[PDB]
Amino acid sequence: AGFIENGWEGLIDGWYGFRHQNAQGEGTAADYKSTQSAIDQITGKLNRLIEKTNQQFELIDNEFNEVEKQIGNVINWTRDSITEVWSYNAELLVAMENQHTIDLADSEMDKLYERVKRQLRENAEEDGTGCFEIFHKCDDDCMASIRNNTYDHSKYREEAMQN
Amino acid sequence: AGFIENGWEGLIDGWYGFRHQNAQGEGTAADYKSTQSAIDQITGKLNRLIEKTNQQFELIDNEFNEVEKQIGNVINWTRDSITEVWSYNAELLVAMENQHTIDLADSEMDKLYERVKRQLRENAEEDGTGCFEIFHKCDDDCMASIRNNTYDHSKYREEAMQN
Amino acid sequence: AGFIENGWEGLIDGWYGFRHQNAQGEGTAADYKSTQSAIDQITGKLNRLIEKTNQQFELIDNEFNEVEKQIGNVINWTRDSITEVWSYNAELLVAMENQHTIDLADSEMDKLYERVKRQLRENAEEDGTGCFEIFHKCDDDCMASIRNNTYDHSKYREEAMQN
Amino acid sequence: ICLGHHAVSNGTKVNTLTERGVEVVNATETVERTNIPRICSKGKRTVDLGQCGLLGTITGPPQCDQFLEFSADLIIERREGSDVCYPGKFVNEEALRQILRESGGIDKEAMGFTYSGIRTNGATSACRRSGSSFYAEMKWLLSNTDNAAFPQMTKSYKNTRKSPALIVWGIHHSVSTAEQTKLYGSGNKLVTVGSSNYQQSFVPSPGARTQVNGLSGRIDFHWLMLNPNDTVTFSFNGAFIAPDRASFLRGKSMGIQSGVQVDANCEGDCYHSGGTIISNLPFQNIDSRAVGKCPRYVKQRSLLLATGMKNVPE
Amino acid sequence: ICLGHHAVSNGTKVNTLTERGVEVVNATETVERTNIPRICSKGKRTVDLGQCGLLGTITGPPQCDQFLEFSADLIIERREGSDVCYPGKFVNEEALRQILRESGGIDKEAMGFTYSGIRTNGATSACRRSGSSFYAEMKWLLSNTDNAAFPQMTKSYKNTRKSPALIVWGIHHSVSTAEQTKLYGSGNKLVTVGSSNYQQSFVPSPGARTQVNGLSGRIDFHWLMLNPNDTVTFSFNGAFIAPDRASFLRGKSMGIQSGVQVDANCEGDCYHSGGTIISNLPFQNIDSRAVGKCPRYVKQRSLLLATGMKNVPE
Amino acid sequence: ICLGHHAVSNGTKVNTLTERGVEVVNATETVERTNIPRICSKGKRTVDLGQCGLLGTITGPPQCDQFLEFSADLIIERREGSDVCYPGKFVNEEALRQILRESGGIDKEAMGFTYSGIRTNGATSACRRSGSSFYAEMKWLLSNTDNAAFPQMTKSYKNTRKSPALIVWGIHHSVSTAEQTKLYGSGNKLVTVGSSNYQQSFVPSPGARTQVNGLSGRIDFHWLMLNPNDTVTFSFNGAFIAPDRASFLRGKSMGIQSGVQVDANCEGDCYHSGGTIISNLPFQNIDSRAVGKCPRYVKQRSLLLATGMKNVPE
C-alpha cells in the first residue's frame, strides 16, 4: 500500500492478483493463497472478538422504587466507573485491532511482492512502482506458469541476460 | 536502526536524510516526505491519547466527617480496584504505544532505504551498512535528482554496468 | 517462517543458524547474535509481565457469617465486574503478547536472511527457499568467514561473476 | 509481471492506534444498538406479575391471589403492581425483593396458629374480594367485642424443613389512639417477635397519616429468614397482623422490571426495561442497567472493527 | 551516497513492550502531577459555605442565615462549617449532603403551618442572633405554660409544585425526663410522619448526652422528599421541631470539599481538597478522590510516552 | 550455504491475535493454579483465634480470655469461633470485624467507672470460668435487690489518648417483662449513648424466645469510636451491660478467614480460605476472594504465554 500507488477497483475476484501486459494480450487473475491468508486472519480476529459471555449479572438497582440514596449513589458510582473502563478497553481494542489488520494486510502484500521477485532471479528487474520488467517476451502460458509458481528460473536466463 | 549502526547528531534539519560524498564535494539534506510521515503518525497518536473526558464523577466520600465504616470500606475497596485497573491500563498503553512508535519509525526508515534502492536499479550496489555504492560519478545535480525522485534509471545504465 | 518451508529439528545449538553444503563436506552452526537478540526480547517480555503487586486488598466479605444481603449483593456485583475486567485484560494481553512474539521472531529471521544476503553482493544469488546459491566453491574456512561476518565481498567477485 | 492488492471505491473509515479515520475495505460493528421491544421468554417459565406486587405474593392481597405459590425462571415486575391493598409498607423492602427475584418461586406452608378468645376476621374495604377481606396469608387479630380486652397471647412456630423459611408479620397503626382501643382495648399494647438471631419489640404508633387507599391507618410489614430447626415466637396483646402461612424458596430464577409485552417466540438472556438485547457482539449501547448475560455496556455509539485491508483506491 | 537518521546526545529513557529503559530522542509526560493550590472558579457561580454547614442551609442556624436560598454551580464545604447551632445530628446526613451538592441551590417556600394553644417561640442561647434564637427554618414547639398539657396536633402539607420538596423536622431529646415533662407535659410523647413512600414513628429518648454547646440535650433531624401532588402528614403532641419552610432544588451543580482559597482567574473542571487539577493529560497522580471531569487516577508517578525515534548516539 | 531456524518434535499450542492453537517451540504458564494448603506465616506475628471470636476479644468471653490484649500482623478467624458466651450478637458486626482485622492488635485500658447503690456482679452460667461468670471486659448492671428501683445514672468517659478508643456497651433483653422488672425494676427502661459525632438511644425488648445456650434472654453489643479529647456519655437506669475497659488499636495488620493449619516455614502474602497462594505469575484461578498482595483473579484456567518461535517441524 506504499509504492503501490493505488488499488485496482476492477479486481473483483480476490484480495490480491496480477495484471500482466505481454505481447499476446493482457490478464488480470487473482491470487488465491495470499487472499485466503488475509481472509483467514481477519476471520480469526472476528471469531475471537465476537464472543458470548457466560457471566450473569443480577439486578442491583430498582427502576420502580428507588433504593436508599447513599447505596444508590455508590451503585451509580461503581457502574459509571466500570462503564468508563469498558469504554476505554473497547476503544483501545478496536483501534489496536484495526492497526494490526492494516499492517497485517500490507505485510501480506509485501510477502507476495518479494515472493514473485524471488521467482524471477535475473530474468526480470524491478521498476519501482511494484512491477517487474521482463527482458524476454513471456507468453500467456509463461505468465500462468509464474502465477502458480512453476516458472523455471533458469530456462529463460541467458535470453533475458543478453537483454 | 539495525544495519544503520548509529544516527547522525549533525542532522538537525529532519528525521531522515541523505549524506552524499561524490567528487564535487559532500551534502547532507533531510528528506521531507518520510520525516513528515512519521511526524504525522506520532502527532496522530498524541491527538488520540491526549483526550478530555466528558464523564463527571460526584463526591462519594467525606473528608471532614467520615461516613459509615462499612460503606466506607466498600467505597475504598472499589476505588482501589478501579485504581489498579487504570494503572494497569495506563502502563500497558504507554508500553504498547512506545513499541509501535519505535517499530513504526524503523519501518519508515526501511521504506526510505528500499525506495532509494528501487530508484537505482543496476547503476548502484548495496554495501551492507546502509549505503549505495555508485559505479559512476554522480554529480551534485545528479544527487539532487536522486533526492527528489527524478533520477533516470536508464540514462546512466551502460556506464555503471561497464564498471 | 514463510518461504522457509520448515524448521530444523536437528538444530539444538541455538534458535537460528546456518547449514552449508560445499565440496569439503557440510556444516550446521548456530548464529549467536540473532538467537541472543530474540532470547533477550522474550526475556524482557517475561520480566515485564511476571510482576508482584504491592497493592494490598482487605477482606470485605465474611465466609463464616454472611453479611447483609443487599450490601453483599453489591459486593458480589462489583467483584464479578472486576473479575470480568481482569479476565478480558488477561486474555487480550496474552493474545497480543503471543502475536508480537511470533512476528518478532519472524522479523529477526528476516533480519538474518537479508543480512547474509547483503554480505554476498554479486557472488551469490537467491534460490527462493531461503538459500544462497554460490557461483564459486566456498570452502569451510570461507563459510566460517561468512558466519562471523568477515567474508570479503570483492576478493571473490570476478570468479563468481564469470559463472 | 506486476502484482498488487484489491481496493473498493467506497471504503469504511475506522480508528487505529495511530490515525483516526483510516479508510479500510470492509468493517463490522462491535457495539450493539438494535433492541427487540419485547421480553423474549422462549423456553423459560415466566410469571408476569401485572397488577400484583412482588412482595404481595408473600402477604397475599386480592391482586396477588393467583401468585401465592407461583413458580418461574423469569419474574417480571410491572409498573402498575402494588404490594399492598391496605395502606402499608415493607421494612427492608428492596432486600426482600432481591431475595424473591432469584427465588425461583415460593411455596407456602401452614404455620398452624389457632386462636382463643379474640376475633380473627379483621377486614377492610380496601382488600376487596367477594366483599371486604384482608391479606390472604395474614390474620388481623381483633378484640372479641367492640372495645373489650385483648389477652396476652404467645404463638411459636418451628421450621421443620431443610430450607430457610420466610416469615412476615405486621404491626398495625390506627388512625388515632382511641380507635386502637376500639380494636384491641384500652392501654398498651406491645408486640414481641423473637428467634435465635432476631428479637424485637414494637409498640404501635397511632396517628393520622396521609390518606392512602382511603384509609389513614398504616400496617408495617416485617420479615425474617428462619433457619431449619429454629423457632420464632410472637408474644403480643394487640395491633398484630399474624402470619398464617410461611414461604419457602423453590429454586433459582431472575427478576426484571419491564413495560413491554411478553414474546414466547424470540429467545434472549439479556433484558432491560425497554425489551430484550439479542446480540453476539461484545459491547452494547442500549441500557447500562441491563441484567442477565449481557454484553458490556459502553458509552460509545459505534466502534467499527476493521475486517479488510487498507483501502487505497483511485 | 549514504542515508540515515538523526540522533541527540541526551535522550529520554522510556518503557516498551520488550525492554525497559529504551533511550529515544524525545518523550512527553502522560501522568499529571502539577496542582494549582486554589479552587479555580472562573465562569462558575460559586458559594463558599465557610462556617455554615451544607445541611444547616435547610434548617438555618445563625451561621447559615446568608445561605438559606443560595444558588450556585459549584458548592464548597469548609472544615470549620457546622450544620447545627443547638447540638443535634441528621439521620442519613451523607445522602442529604449528596443531594444538596448537585442541587444547584435551594429555594424555600412557606409550608403554612398555623398553631393554636401552645407556645411556639422556643429558643436557646446557643443559636444566638440578637439575643437567644432558634433555627430560622424551624419552630421549637413547646407547651403553653411552664408545664401544662401539650394538646395533640396534626399538620398536613401538600406539595403543590412540579418538583420534589425537601421536608425536614426534628425530634427533641431533653436532658432528663423531668425537663421533657416540663417542656411538653407528662405522659408518653409520640410523633408520626406519613406520606406515599414514607412512614414512622418516633418516640423521644430523654437523657444526658455529652456536653456540646454547654447543652446536654439533642435534636434529631429527619427529612423526606415529597413528590408533586403528594401529601405529608404529622401527628404530634410534644418534643417536636416543626418545619416552617420547605426546600426545592433549583437545578444542577457540583459539591467539593476543599481548604484552599477561591480563585476567579483560573478555570478548571477537576477539583480536590488540595486545589484544582488543570491538565489535558489522560492520567493524573495527585488525588484518587478528585471529582468532576478529571483524568483517570493511576499510582504510577511518571509514564513517559515516546515522541521520537530510537536514539542511537555516536 | 543455507540458513534457517530450529524446531522441536513436540511443541506447545498457544493463542494469538490471529489464530487459536499456534504450535510454538516453548511456552510458560501465566495463570497460577498451585495452592499451598497451609497458612504461610513465616516472619509474621500470627494470632490463631481458634474458638475465640474476633469481636469477643473486645467483650471478653471465656474462650477469649487469652486474646484480650493480643498483638499480631496476621489475624486468622476460625469457623468454630464464637463472639459471645451469653446468647446475643453485635450490631454493625462486620464493620467492627473489618476494623479489628487491620488493627494490629488491641490494648485495653480501665475506663474508671465507679458505682454506688446497685449490683455490678451480674453473671450467667453460659459464660462459665471457675463457676458462673460474665464477660471479662463488661459488667452486668442489676438492681440492688429483687425488683426495687434501679437509680438513674450517668457515666462519662473522656479519651485521654492520641488514638481513637473503641467503646462497647450492651443492652439486655430478658425472657419476659417480669424478669426485667425483677432485675431492674418496673417502668420503661432506656439507655442513652452520646458523644460529639454519635447519639443513639437504645431500648430493651423483654419478649419470649427459644433457648440458645439454654437461655431465652439476649445481650446485644453496640460500639462507637471516641476521638482524642472527645467525651462519651451514658444515661441508664437498668438493662445495662456497662463497659469496664476500652480498646485502642495497636497498629496495622491483616485479617483472613481460613480452615487450614498454620505453617511457619513457608512465606507468602496472598491468603484465602484454602491456604496460601505463593506465585510470581500476574494471574491466578484459585480464589476470587483472595486477600493480601495477590495476582489478579481471572476465569481462565490456563493462558500459555509463548516463549519460543513458531514450531514448524517435519
Coordinates of N, CA, C and O in Angstrom, one line a residue, chain A residues 70-126:
Chain A
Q70 N -27.9 6.8 49.5 CA -26.5 6.6 49.6 C -26.0 5.4 48.9 O -25.1 5.5 48.0
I71 N -26.6 4.2 49.1 CA -26.2 3.0 48.4 C -26.5 3.1 46.9 O -25.8 2.5 46.1
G72 N -27.5 3.9 46.6 CA -27.8 4.1 45.2 C -26.7 5.0 44.5 O -26.3 4.7 43.4
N73 N -26.2 6.0 45.2 CA -25.1 6.8 44.7 C -23.8 5.9 44.6 O -23.0 6.1 43.7
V74 N -23.6 5.0 45.5 CA -22.5 4.1 45.4 C -22.6 3.2 44.2 O -21.7 2.9 43.5
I75 N -23.9 2.7 44.0 CA -24.1 1.8 42.8 C -23.9 2.5 41.5 O -23.2 2.0 40.6
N76 N -24.4 3.7 41.4 CA -24.2 4.5 40.2 C -22.7 4.9 40.0 O -22.3 5.0 38.9
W77 N -22.0 5.1 41.1 CA -20.6 5.5 41.0 C -19.8 4.3 40.5 O -19.0 4.4 39.6
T78 N -20.0 3.1 41.1 CA -19.3 1.9 40.6 C -19.7 1.6 39.1 O -18.9 1.2 38.3
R79 N -21.0 1.7 38.8 CA -21.4 1.4 37.4 C -20.8 2.4 36.4 O -20.5 2.0 35.3
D80 N -20.7 3.7 36.8 CA -20.1 4.6 35.9 C -18.6 4.4 35.8 O -18.1 4.5 34.7
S81 N -17.9 4.0 36.9 CA -16.5 3.6 36.8 C -16.3 2.4 35.8 O -15.5 2.5 34.9
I82 N -17.1 1.4 36.0 CA -17.0 0.2 35.1 C -17.3 0.6 33.7 O -16.7 0.1 32.7
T83 N -18.3 1.4 33.5 CA -18.6 1.9 32.2 C -17.5 2.6 31.5 O -17.2 2.4 30.3
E84 N -16.8 3.5 32.3 CA -15.6 4.1 31.7 C -14.5 3.1 31.4 O -13.8 3.2 30.3
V85 N -14.3 2.1 32.2 CA -13.3 1.1 32.0 C -13.6 0.3 30.7 O -12.7 0.2 29.8
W86 N -14.8 -0.1 30.5 CA -15.2 -0.9 29.3 C -15.2 0.0 28.1 O -14.9 -0.5 27.0
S87 N -15.5 1.3 28.2 CA -15.5 2.2 27.1 C -14.0 2.3 26.6 O -13.7 2.3 25.4
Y88 N -13.1 2.5 27.6 CA -11.7 2.7 27.2 C -11.2 1.4 26.6 O -10.5 1.4 25.6
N89 N -11.5 0.2 27.2 CA -11.0 -1.0 26.7 C -11.6 -1.3 25.3 O -10.9 -1.9 24.4
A90 N -12.8 -0.9 25.0 CA -13.4 -1.2 23.7 C -12.8 -0.2 22.7 O -12.5 -0.7 21.6
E91 N -12.6 1.1 23.0 CA -12.0 2.0 22.1 C -10.5 1.5 21.7 O -10.2 1.4 20.6
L92 N -9.7 1.3 22.8 CA -8.3 0.9 22.5 C -8.3 -0.5 21.8 O -7.4 -0.7 20.9
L93 N -9.2 -1.4 22.1 CA -9.3 -2.7 21.4 C -9.5 -2.5 19.9 O -8.8 -3.0 19.1
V94 N -10.6 -1.7 19.6 CA -10.9 -1.5 18.2 C -9.7 -0.8 17.5 O -9.4 -1.2 16.4
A95 N -9.1 0.2 18.1 CA -8.0 0.9 17.5 C -6.9 0.0 17.2 O -6.4 -0.1 16.0
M96 N -6.4 -0.8 18.2 CA -5.3 -1.7 18.0 C -5.6 -2.7 17.0 O -4.7 -3.1 16.1
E97 N -6.8 -3.3 17.0 CA -7.1 -4.4 16.1 C -7.1 -3.8 14.6 O -6.7 -4.5 13.7
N98 N -7.7 -2.6 14.4 CA -7.6 -2.0 13.1 C -6.2 -1.8 12.6 O -5.9 -2.1 11.5
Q99 N -5.4 -1.2 13.5 CA -4.0 -1.0 13.1 C -3.3 -2.3 12.7 O -2.7 -2.4 11.6
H100 N -3.4 -3.4 13.5 CA -2.8 -4.6 13.2 C -3.4 -5.3 12.0 O -2.7 -6.0 11.3
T101 N -4.6 -5.0 11.7 CA -5.2 -5.5 10.5 C -4.6 -4.9 9.3 O -4.3 -5.5 8.3
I102 N -4.5 -3.5 9.3 CA -3.9 -2.8 8.1 C -2.5 -3.2 7.9 O -2.1 -3.7 6.8
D103 N -1.7 -3.2 9.0 CA -0.3 -3.5 8.8 C -0.1 -5.0 8.5 O 0.8 -5.4 7.7
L104 N -1.0 -5.9 8.9 CA -1.0 -7.3 8.6 C -1.2 -7.5 7.1 O -0.5 -8.2 6.4
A105 N -2.3 -6.8 6.5 CA -2.6 -6.9 5.1 C -1.4 -6.4 4.3 O -1.1 -7.0 3.2
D106 N -0.9 -5.2 4.7 CA 0.3 -4.7 4.0 C 1.4 -5.7 4.0 O 2.2 -5.9 3.0
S107 N 1.6 -6.4 5.1 CA 2.7 -7.4 5.2 C 2.4 -8.5 4.3 O 3.4 -9.1 3.6
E108 N 1.2 -9.0 4.1 CA 0.8 -10.0 3.1 C 1.2 -9.5 1.7 O 1.7 -10.3 0.9
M109 N 0.8 -8.3 1.4 CA 1.1 -7.7 0.1 C 2.6 -7.8 -0.2 O 3.1 -8.2 -1.3
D110 N 3.4 -7.3 0.8 CA 4.9 -7.3 0.6 C 5.4 -8.8 0.5 O 6.3 -9.0 -0.3
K111 N 4.8 -9.7 1.2 CA 5.1 -11.1 1.1 C 5.0 -11.6 -0.4 O 5.8 -12.2 -0.9
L112 N 3.8 -11.3 -1.0 CA 3.6 -11.7 -2.3 C 4.6 -11.0 -3.3 O 5.1 -11.7 -4.2
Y113 N 4.8 -9.7 -3.1 CA 5.7 -9.0 -4.0 C 7.1 -9.6 -4.0 O 7.7 -9.9 -5.0
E114 N 7.7 -9.8 -2.8 CA 9.0 -10.4 -2.7 C 9.0 -11.9 -3.1 O 10.1 -12.4 -3.5
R115 N 7.9 -12.5 -3.0 CA 7.8 -13.9 -3.4 C 8.0 -14.0 -5.0 O 8.8 -14.7 -5.5
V116 N 7.1 -13.2 -5.7 CA 7.3 -13.2 -7.1 C 8.6 -12.6 -7.5 O 9.2 -13.1 -8.6
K117 N 9.2 -11.7 -6.8 CA 10.5 -11.2 -7.0 C 11.5 -12.3 -6.9 O 12.5 -12.4 -7.7
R118 N 11.4 -13.2 -5.9 CA 12.3 -14.3 -5.8 C 12.1 -15.4 -6.9 O 13.0 -16.2 -7.1
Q119 N 10.9 -15.4 -7.5 CA 10.7 -16.3 -8.6 C 11.5 -15.9 -9.8 O 12.0 -16.8 -10.5
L120 N 11.6 -14.6 -10.1 CA 12.4 -14.1 -11.2 C 13.7 -13.6 -10.7 O 13.8 -12.5 -10.2
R121 N 14.8 -14.4 -10.9 CA 16.1 -14.1 -10.2 C 16.8 -13.1 -11.0 O 17.0 -11.9 -10.6
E122 N 17.3 -13.4 -12.2 CA 17.9 -12.5 -13.1 C 17.2 -12.2 -14.4 O 17.7 -11.5 -15.3
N123 N 16.0 -12.9 -14.6 CA 15.3 -12.8 -15.9 C 14.4 -11.5 -15.9 O 13.8 -11.2 -16.9
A124 N 14.3 -10.8 -14.8 CA 13.4 -9.6 -14.7 C 14.1 -8.6 -13.7 O 14.9 -9.0 -12.9
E125 N 13.6 -7.4 -13.8 CA 14.2 -6.3 -12.9 C 13.0 -5.5 -12.4 O 12.0 -5.3 -13.1
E126 N 13.2 -5.0 -11.1 CA 12.2 -4.2 -10.5 C 12.1 -2.8 -11.3 O 13.0 -2.3 -11.8

